[PDB]
Symmetry: D3
Subunit: 309 residues, 6 copies
Amino acid sequence: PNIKIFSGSSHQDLSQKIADRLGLELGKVVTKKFSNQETCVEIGESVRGEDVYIVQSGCGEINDNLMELLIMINACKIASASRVTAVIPCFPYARQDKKDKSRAPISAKLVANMLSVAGADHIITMDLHASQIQGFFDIPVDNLYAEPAVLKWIRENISEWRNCTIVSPDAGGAKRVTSIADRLNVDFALIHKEDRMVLVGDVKDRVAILVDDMADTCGTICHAADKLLSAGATRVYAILTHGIFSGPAISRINNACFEAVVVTNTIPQEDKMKHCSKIQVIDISMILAEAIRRTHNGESVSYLFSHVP
Amino acid sequence: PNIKIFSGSSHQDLSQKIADRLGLELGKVVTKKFSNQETCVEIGESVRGEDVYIVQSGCGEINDNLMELLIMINACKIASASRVTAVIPCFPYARQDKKDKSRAPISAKLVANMLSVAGADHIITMDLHASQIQGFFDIPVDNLYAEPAVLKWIRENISEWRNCTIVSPDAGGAKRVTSIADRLNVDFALIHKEDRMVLVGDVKDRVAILVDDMADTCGTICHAADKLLSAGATRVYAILTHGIFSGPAISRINNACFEAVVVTNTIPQEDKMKHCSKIQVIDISMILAEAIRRTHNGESVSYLFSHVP
Amino acid sequence: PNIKIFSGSSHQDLSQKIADRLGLELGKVVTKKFSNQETCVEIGESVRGEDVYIVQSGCGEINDNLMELLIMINACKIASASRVTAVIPCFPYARQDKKDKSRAPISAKLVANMLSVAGADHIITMDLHASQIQGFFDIPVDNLYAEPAVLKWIRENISEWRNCTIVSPDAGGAKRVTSIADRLNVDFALIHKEDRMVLVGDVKDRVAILVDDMADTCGTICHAADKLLSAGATRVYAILTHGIFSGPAISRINNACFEAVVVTNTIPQEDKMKHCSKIQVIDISMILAEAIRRTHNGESVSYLFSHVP
Amino acid sequence: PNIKIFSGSSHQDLSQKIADRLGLELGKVVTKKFSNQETCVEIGESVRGEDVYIVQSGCGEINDNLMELLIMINACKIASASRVTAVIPCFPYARQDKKDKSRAPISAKLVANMLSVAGADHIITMDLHASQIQGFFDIPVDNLYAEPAVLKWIRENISEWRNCTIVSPDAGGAKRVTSIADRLNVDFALIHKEDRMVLVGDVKDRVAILVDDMADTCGTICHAADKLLSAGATRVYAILTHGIFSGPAISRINNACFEAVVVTNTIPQEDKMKHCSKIQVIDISMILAEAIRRTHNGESVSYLFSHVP
Amino acid sequence: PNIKIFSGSSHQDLSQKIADRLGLELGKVVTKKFSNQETCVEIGESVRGEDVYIVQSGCGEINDNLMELLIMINACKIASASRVTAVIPCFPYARQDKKDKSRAPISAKLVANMLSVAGADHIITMDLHASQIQGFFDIPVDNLYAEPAVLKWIRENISEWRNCTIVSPDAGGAKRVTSIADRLNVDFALIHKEDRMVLVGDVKDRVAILVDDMADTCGTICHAADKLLSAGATRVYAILTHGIFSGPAISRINNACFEAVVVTNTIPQEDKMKHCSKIQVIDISMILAEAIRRTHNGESVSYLFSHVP
Amino acid sequence: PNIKIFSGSSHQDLSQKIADRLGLELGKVVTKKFSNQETCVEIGESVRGEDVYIVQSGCGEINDNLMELLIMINACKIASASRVTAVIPCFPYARQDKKDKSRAPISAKLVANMLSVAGADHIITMDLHASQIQGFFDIPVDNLYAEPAVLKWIRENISEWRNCTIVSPDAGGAKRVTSIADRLNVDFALIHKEDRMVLVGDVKDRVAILVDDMADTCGTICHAADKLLSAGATRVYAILTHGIFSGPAISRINNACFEAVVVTNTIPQEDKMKHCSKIQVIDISMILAEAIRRTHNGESVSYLFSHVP
Ligand SMILES: Nc1ncnc2c1ncn2[C@@H]1O[C@H](COP(=O)(O)OP(=O)(O)OP(=O)(O)O)[C@@H](O)[C@H]1O
Ligand SMILES: Nc1ncnc2c1ncn2[C@@H]1O[C@H](COP(=O)(O)OP(=O)(O)OP(=O)(O)O)[C@@H](O)[C@H]1O
Ligand SMILES: Nc1ncnc2c1ncn2[C@@H]1O[C@H](COP(=O)(O)OP(=O)(O)OP(=O)(O)O)[C@@H](O)[C@H]1O
Ligand SMILES: Nc1ncnc2c1ncn2[C@@H]1O[C@H](COP(=O)(O)OP(=O)(O)OP(=O)(O)O)[C@@H](O)[C@H]1O
Ligand SMILES: Nc1ncnc2c1ncn2[C@@H]1O[C@H](COP(=O)(O)OP(=O)(O)OP(=O)(O)O)[C@@H](O)[C@H]1O
Ligand SMILES: Nc1ncnc2c1ncn2[C@@H]1O[C@H](COP(=O)(O)OP(=O)(O)OP(=O)(O)O)[C@@H](O)[C@H]1O
Ligand SMILES: [Mg+2]
Ligand SMILES: [Mg+2]
Ligand SMILES: [Mg+2]
Ligand SMILES: [Mg+2]
Ligand SMILES: [Mg+2]
Ligand SMILES: [Mg+2]
Ligand SMILES: [Mg+2]
Ligand SMILES: [Mg+2]
């Protein structure tokens, strides 16, 4: 059983980077639309008895990409692939992980059920919005972390990183920032709203680094950055694993005081970089490629939680 | 347990017509998109212990509508609805009902599995592309027929209907046309391609009526109509239950010789009628409403296969 | 189909209170242990065609109680009960809702799967540790809130409640306290550890009310209370929906500065009240009884999120 | 994991031919009936960790053979076989693949469900009546085609094959005949009933070859052959992949004008050949053996759609 | 939801008796065979929203009857019956309930799985060979007992019943006979083989009554009766709930010393009574009818374990 | 894929013996209790792609051990183990394998369902109380037999074993004793209660050996031994595969006439041996180790039914 990497249409550059790091060519697949806009998928090579990995992120036209992924999984499964793995760098509907006093769907659970029923045997993803989403599955889920790559970027790009403060934009992400603060041996601050925000932790004359899983409309991080500059911070960075940047995010970032907005490439960023000078991209294709290769060879994946490959 | 009718965003006029025929108001639901284009659904009223019917056709932005339907089904199911029924007038991915010497998905089966796993207890649909799709489910599926309404339209709109010929555009649909030919006591002709088409059955000086389940790009029916005019037909009609009309269909119909292109309203048609004068719409909301009401009350649904309500 | 309420051995007083509020007698069931300590269950009355509710909390001997609940559910399901509902005021293994960089089980998901496979059709619980646990099920889950009863207690027991500060012991519970702070129109403070704790929000000369879902060993709330007294608070209360009080909790509370430690009766408290004077109990049996009665009659359960019955 | 081939009682000659082509001996199994006519199955060798293939066609005493197959699958699955594959050359109940305005079962779907629940991991079959039956499964199904062997037979047995006409007995099978007509570069004709039949396509002074998936009572092919002789055909052949030949088929064929009735050996034919001189048998055991060997070794099976091995 | 009783072809007299006791007519169903011997089923009336009971015993052509039952269940389930119950007086493959050091199927479990996957919601049966078969299902199973009817027959037909001895033919059935011996206040004896049999319990000058669940070949009961006459018994009776009587059973009974061989009518007996004078039939249609009516109305079924209705 | 053996807390000595016989070290796992007595499990090494065997018997605190086993299975399954096998020497709730005229659970079936839903792929157990429990699973179950080890012990410990009588304590176990009696070529006796017991078979001046699957309270075997001494037996032995010894068993055995009470070590016995001199232990760790090694290597397990390794 050999590795076969297939790309959905969502993030083809990431799939190519992963394939190069694995020393493989992308599997032959046609993924287009019929005239009535139904997804058309044709696997152009035999996957019989192979270990198939389908790379598709929850970005762009999310429902189209999700249906493409489900259809590709189904096609590979009924084509007698030995194992089918969904590599989903940004998990769609992850923020709908609970009801919370509303007659709302748990869309993340529905997506997990659909992936299971399509025939996925395994899920590889990066920085799930809530790690409880792992429990939405009955198949194994490897939730990778961008934190090693983030730490690497911080050390090689922020000269004052030993005196910086890692800041959570809200009370929800504090855990994450504390982890980073532990790995860098720096202070960590929290910010939460009472339209006013309150900040705990000295940030004067120090570089502040907001850290988060995602930036969708960037209202949260822009408000946090305004507060950090109010409290005497020297420069404010924002580091996010998922740069969705929908709606007014680009305009707000352009009008914000960030020195840089670093995001990983779990979502393609070329279009946003055109209209926003301060967006920078961390490659995480090495982490994804190593996770694929370790799941295939039966090596430890959790080794990657703390080690940059 | 009362009837609750909910509308997806795909076909709101049809849902309203069904609700009026049932003497009900449409259930309060918010169906919009988040900024990153994920579907947002909020059920605005309690559905606890109710018989819920969600109306959504496989039309327009098909993957968006399908995800909306799945999310709404999930929301109603975890909101403790007694029973959830999907009313899908045009079934999405119905034409991908087999592989046939290709490494292709069976997308119709995947859609059926997704509907089941979302929590659908029952499916109501009209003129499935292949009735074998009923076997793709383990829940009951009521596949209604537009044929009674088509027969009614033919009798009240074609003055020469007693001397007409019902024509299949291809060998696949012959069964359907024979059924119609049996109910009208008229001749039935077949047409199949060898770029040339061959026609069996006298059509000279007689009105010809092409009959089909759907018109997507209308290449099939336009070629058939050209052949029918070649063979001396007086006027050529086309009657289809599903008017998808994607791609170049409107231009081809405008350049074709059809007296009329009659379609049911399983798919909204207002935009197409603007650009195509010869499209006409049969209302089938009475059939759908009667099917909903009969499934709710435990009356016979198959009664509708031959009776216009 | 009538309501049948059955009690597990974990919390018989709560089951009796619920049964009285419903105007019913507890169903005849024998729940003992065989000599080799296997659970023995015998349903002493016919439950055929009935709406069965089994009350069992995740307290005391947790694995014994959980197995008792599963066995009782199975016995009722194979005895042809029309519907079986598990009323689990405190959900066992709720704190094991994720893996988080550890080769650990997701025990909450396992418990959900076991409840589903035993035959539960519905779950009623109170203040799930994480509401994402709702997504661990495919059956409906009604997660009730003790907040209405807590607000009632605060108003009728704390004379200075209009000038009080609602305090979260950690960043995780802030949402909850904000909700309470919104319903009382008072200030809300956060506390988080950097062995030192940092507090945001004025608490001097004001009554402080720590709020939380559970108190197991009470290290968190005792440290928070020490910090609140350091910051000039007048009196410190603690209000928790689940009073587990395991390990050294009673000694720590006895040595702490709390004016009172209010907990709901989702877990029996009589033994702890003997050794701890400042524990007080809020009855939530009315909320549970109303939820049972509303699920049975098909009325709105979410009505209870904001209304004391 | 090695190949183990087991024979049901339905078609032992085919199983032996497949085993010889694989270079294997048939696995030791006892398949008899108890006194009360219940199937008795005993696997006479260990299948632990093996790739098991059970050969059983839907022929003869169909319900007995189907139950034998299910029981053998179950016995191998609980005996810890690594993988169990059902090799079903003629799929039982394949013609009950839809309801079609009748309160009828979808028996093909029921058979698929029973095969899945017995523990089949994979299905190998030949010329499914409708390829939509593939969607009735969630396990992979390889639907082989007798067409390569049919083309070989036509070329080596019909001297005038370059000037022949391939004829469909009905509108349903046209696809199949067109495929054959494409591979031979000959004309293709259709025949359909209006008790009268209409034929399109010149057949005078040319050899006609009716092609079909199965012949049960042979009314269809006998009527088609009568019509072909009416239209001036020189000789009429019939080629079917499944020679069921039930009821009056043998008498009708004996009284028909066929030069030969060629069928594959998916169903044993020795008894029918005794009473019908013009039946001839194509061996397809090479196709089945190659499909088994390619599924075992992870090679391409679809290679066989166009290549005789 | 009303009761609908449908008969399979296995035991039509029993179905009619049950229908008369329920005050109902048998539901319109066609159950025949296609030419190729596949089961053909057509439900001749709407079962939508009804409580359907299908009566079919594991007798005669067992695999044909079992397939008929599965097909009828499937037809009713996809016809939107509210509930489908299989009434199986004699459960097929019940004696294959374990493997026991053999590479054998557990055919009873396979049958249970097939019944569940066909769509059965409930099973009613009489005197399961092993009551552990109840655990083979996940749906409720009501296993009725012929013992009340047997006790009635014994009292009204054996004048010396107060001084009789109830005898088990083997060690396996002892429980059953003890139950009967308890309800009659008589002695109970056991017989087991060491070709020789050993009997415990005085039987001289007393009427002996062998009791058993089934008689297939009647070797067991004939050997037991020979031993009982050896030990000085006056008359020997045999009472069995299931009179299968396959193979040489009729000849052996004719050559045996039984005064009577009483069996219930879970299996049709008219043909066997023609060739065997000493077979007598107990009607158990009242027990089956009462069980159906009590499951429908939600009354206690276990009431029937001790009460003749 | 390598063998990984993990021990639950129930029987660590047995797990160590098995690990030594396999030439392996026990896998690193932490199995403790949280403060509130919930099971805490942490797998201390990667099990990705491994063949995992978890050893846990149904002994001691049965519900705690069962929950530990389920949690460990779940942890290994979501840690991407290739295969997870539960090695359960004494199966919990095995005696609750049926309902039998009681509104009781089938707890054995519930346990089987829970093991399956936790993710077990395979079960290895010894002397199931009823072999029908094998049918409670859909995964393969290997039910090993202590009989080879028992025969070995009898030959090497009872000098008069050629003239002994193997005695069943009840009618239920007769099969077992007959098997042993066949393998030793000795007489076999039965004992059953009418408070009086009746014995068939000469036992005077001969050593008697009671044989059974388990001894819980030892009332059965103590009464049987009293009867055997009444009937002139010289010495009475008892041999049981499962020595549960709960309740008053130790006192009764101490007051009984047994020469020895031999049990296997499927359950730890050190504590009972302290208070009971006549308990002796047969090691069956070789049988379990050989079964594990044969399932891993795909060799025959049933070879062990008759051969001591
Ligand atoms: N794609 C989306 N875009 C925007 N909002 C979304 C999206 N999906 C869900 N939501 C909504 O966003 C809210 C969830 O917000 P968020 O995840 O930031 O906070 P939380 O879950 O309440 O708390 P926290 O993550 O801090 O523990 C819900 O109301 C949910 O319905
Ligand atoms: N939405 C779609 N639009 C266009 N083509 C589609 C769509 N979905 C599937 N197809 C393709 O269309 C083909 C199916 O065509 P069609 O249903 O007209 O004929 P058929 O199934 O071969 O025969 P028939 O319906 O006459 O029995 C397949 O190749 C399928 O992949
Ligand atoms: N019964 C239990 N008693 C104590 N600790 C437990 C128990 N069950 C699980 N845990 C452990 O407690 C930790 C979970 O702690 P907790 O719920 O307080 O914080 P969190 O989930 O990390 O964050 P938060 O709830 O603030 O969002 C995990 O390490 C888990 O293994
Ligand atoms: N074993 C059988 N023998 C005979 N008739 C059968 C059998 N099984 C099902 N049938 C019936 O035969 C009919 C199906 O016929 P057939 O497959 O020839 O045509 P179709 O499915 O209507 O169309 P087509 O295959 O041309 O697209 C149905 O009425 C079905 O109930
Ligand atoms: N229909 C059948 N006719 C005859 N024998 C059968 C049938 N089905 C299974 N058997 C076989 O009969 C045997 C089962 O026999 P039986 O039920 O009389 O005894 P048991 O299960 O060993 O013990 P007991 O029922 O006394 O506890 C098995 O070998 C089984 O394979
Ligand atoms: N752990 C247990 N300890 C004691 N009794 C139990 C236990 N579990 C179940 N029981 C009860 O013990 C009885 C089962 O007894 P037992 O297995 O000895 O006999 P049986 O199943 O009736 O017949 P036999 O095994 O001889 O065929 C049932 O009433 C069951 O509820
Ligand atoms: Mg969130
Ligand atoms: Mg956030
Ligand atoms: Mg088609
Ligand atoms: Mg078509
Ligand atoms: Mg907390
Ligand atoms: Mg045909
Ligand atoms: Mg018997
Ligand atoms: Mg016993």
